[PDB]
Amino acid sequence: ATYNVKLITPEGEVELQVPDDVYILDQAEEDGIDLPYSCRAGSCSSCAGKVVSGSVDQSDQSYLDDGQIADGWVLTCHAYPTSDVVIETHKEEELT
Numbered sequence: 001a002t003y004n005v006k007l008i009t010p011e012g013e014v015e016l017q018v019p020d021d022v023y024i025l026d027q028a029e030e031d032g033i034d035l036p037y038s039c040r041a042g043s044c045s046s047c048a049g050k051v052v053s054g055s056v057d058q059s060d061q062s063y064l065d066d067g068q069i070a071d072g073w074v075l076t077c078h079a080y081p082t083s084d085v086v087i088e089t090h091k092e093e094e095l096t
């Protein structure tokens with residue numbers, strides 16, 4: 001399947017279609033949309049975002065704890081969409 005992913009960036013909303021087997025960061029980059037990252041391995045805070053609605057699979061990220069996951073935090077470099085999803089990006093500072 002492929003899902004509608006709305007990214008609310010610091011400079012506005014942009015929508016893109018992300019296959020369920022492509023990481024959200026990776027699709028964004030291919031579609032010309034600059035999101036922050038560092039490790040691209042699921043083990044830092046750089047690519048942090050917060051889910052507004054919808055769901056992702058980020059099993060196999062390691063940095064976020066269950067508290068942070070329960071509060072909607074997502075590492076965009078190691079997250080696949082599992083429904084249409086709305087995600088605020090560039091949220092490291094708020095995490096961190």
Ligand code: FES
Binds near residue numbers: 038
């Ligand atoms: S860029 Fe480090 S966890 Fe995503």
